[PDB]
Write an enzyme that holds these catalytic residues in place. Sequence first.
Site, PDB file in Angstrom:
ATOM      1  N   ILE A   1      -3.288  -4.791   0.613  1.00 54.49           N
ATOM      2  CA  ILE A   1      -3.881  -5.914   1.317  1.00 54.49           C
ATOM      3  C   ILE A   1      -2.921  -6.473   2.370  1.00 54.49           C
ATOM      4  CG2 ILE A   1      -4.737  -8.281   1.024  1.00 54.49           C
ATOM      5  CD1 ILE A   1      -5.556  -7.491  -1.810  1.00 54.49           C
ATOM      6  N   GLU A   2      -1.614  -6.157   2.240  1.00 52.03           N
ATOM      7  CA  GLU A   2      -0.566  -6.720   3.094  1.00 52.03           C
ATOM      8  C   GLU A   2       0.086  -5.628   3.942  1.00 52.03           C
ATOM      9  OE1 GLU A   2       1.461  -9.073   0.044  1.00 52.03           O
ATOM     10  OE2 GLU A   2       0.120 -10.774   0.418  1.00 52.03           O
ATOM     11  N   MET A   3       1.254  -5.122   3.516  1.00 55.39           N
ATOM     12  CA  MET A   3       2.004  -4.152   4.297  1.00 55.39           C
ATOM     13  C   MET A   3       1.517  -2.731   4.052  1.00 55.39           C
ATOM     14  SD  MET A   3       5.736  -5.901   4.108  1.00 55.39           S
ATOM     15  CE  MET A   3       6.537  -6.141   5.694  1.00 55.39           C
TER      16      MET A   3
END
Length: 417
Positions: free
Chosen positions: A224-226
């Site tokens: 969901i992020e990196m």
Amino acid sequence: ENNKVLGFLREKGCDYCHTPSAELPAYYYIPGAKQLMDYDIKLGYKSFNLEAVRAALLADKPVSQSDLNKIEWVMQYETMPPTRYTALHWAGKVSDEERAEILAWIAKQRAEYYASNDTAPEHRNEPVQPIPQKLPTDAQKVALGFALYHDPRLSADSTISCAHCHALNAGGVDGRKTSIGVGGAVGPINAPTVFNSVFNVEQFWDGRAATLQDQAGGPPLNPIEMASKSWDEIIAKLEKDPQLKTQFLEVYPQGFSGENITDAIAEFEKTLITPDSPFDKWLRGDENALTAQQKKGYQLFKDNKCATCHGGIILGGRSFEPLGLKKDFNFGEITAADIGRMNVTKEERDKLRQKVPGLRNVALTAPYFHRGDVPTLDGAVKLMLRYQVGKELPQEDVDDIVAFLHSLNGVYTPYMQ
Ligand code: HEC
Ligand code: HEC
Ligand code: HEM
Ligand SMILES: [Ca+2]
Ligand SMILES: [Ca+2]
Ligand SMILES: [Cl-]
């Protein structure tokens, strides 16, 4: 003297409402008020867990600042037990003598464990302390962590570094409702500030990471992020950078790894503190560091129970509290992000509980609440009065608390100078 406090708590029937409770026998209950009394029994426990305090007392350990802050408050305003139960066989009234003693015992708990030497004598018994002016760090490891914090190669795309969600010039935060990750993934919760994170008991709203280092292993591999597949993927890219690799091997001659990158970043994060807020300078004895309004705001803050949860060094960050303590919150629908600490513990009581946010620099970390849906401090304070305290306040007093919150903007010294 520990045992004196424990004797008191047992004597006065505090444990009936502040420990996990069987249905009591019928002769405890007031006719006509059975439901209110059941509601009081549950709200007591939700509001204050005495088993934590009993446990600390018996191992001769520090009581948490939140628990002292709560107990001080109830003693100061003479709230406990609720007056309607005090003529009952099982609940005692608390005398002026006994109140003064508990308040004294708190003060010596705070002096032993929490007050700092550099705050003015008159303020050493506050429910709050100034940010230490320095934490000891390894300078070489800081320089690494600084580079890695700002290195987009930790993301699949090579476009997102830690700075994307936590810009150090913008309060340690992205200023969005929730963060935008690789592939435009919209994230589930508001990104908190990295400023003064080192003082949190645990990291993440749900508290699922113990330390800065464990936290730092999250975003790099979070889809969901990196969204990197593995540390192997990340390192294959960092390996092609001599400047960075040479500097890296100087520390950690083992070479690149998750352990070592997370360690470097964590050390850097211990430098992201913001001492010398006007508030802290006032705690240190500078009377003119605050306005008349900010002093009043600070008094209001304590008067309306804010320091019970938002205590300690960072005015929060030290405990998990339900959103909607004194009144059910209007979630609309409860999501997994709203469930909070229970995701970690699996415990019914932890449902809806959330690490209390440190209010340091809060004036710079809009928007507010974990949902990221509260755009102003006026709003956040009002919503906290309704839901966490169970109260209304006139505008003028809200404005005063807000002014005080503006006093919590610390001073970050930029790494490069
Ligand atoms: C890159 C290595 C970093 C570092 C050092 C940090 N972050 Fe973030 N972060 C983001 C969100 C939404 C949260 C809250 C998530 C949740 O509760 O589930 C966080 C949380 C943190 C913390 C915890 C601080 C606290 O007070 O609880 C810390 C210390 C932290 N981060 C540091 C969002 C993002 C991103 C969005 C795309 C990115 C990228 C990162 N984080 C990366 C990092
Ligand atoms: C005075 C009455 C209070 C003021 C002023 C503030 N608080 Fe709190 N607080 C608590 C929690 C668990 C949260 C996070 C809530 C969530 O999940 O959305 C908060 C949040 C705030 C915020 C917003 C900070 C931010 O978004 O980073 C502000 C500005 C704030 N609080 C001010 C818990 C409690 C608490 C527990 C029982 C009490 C008594 C208070 N808060 C009281 C106040
Ligand atoms: C001396 C004994 C007790 C102590 C030390 C004590 C302590 C506390 C503390 C620290 C809080 C949290 C502060 C707050 O939320 O306002 C609190 C709240 C509460 N306690 Fe107790 N308590 C005692 C006895 C009782 C008893 C016997 C009951 C129920 C019959 C009770 C019911 C509650 C309730 C309902 C709350 C929530 C208060 C509110 O919203 O006003 N307490 N108490
Ligand atoms: Ca009695
Ligand atoms: Ca925010
Ligand atoms: Cl604490």
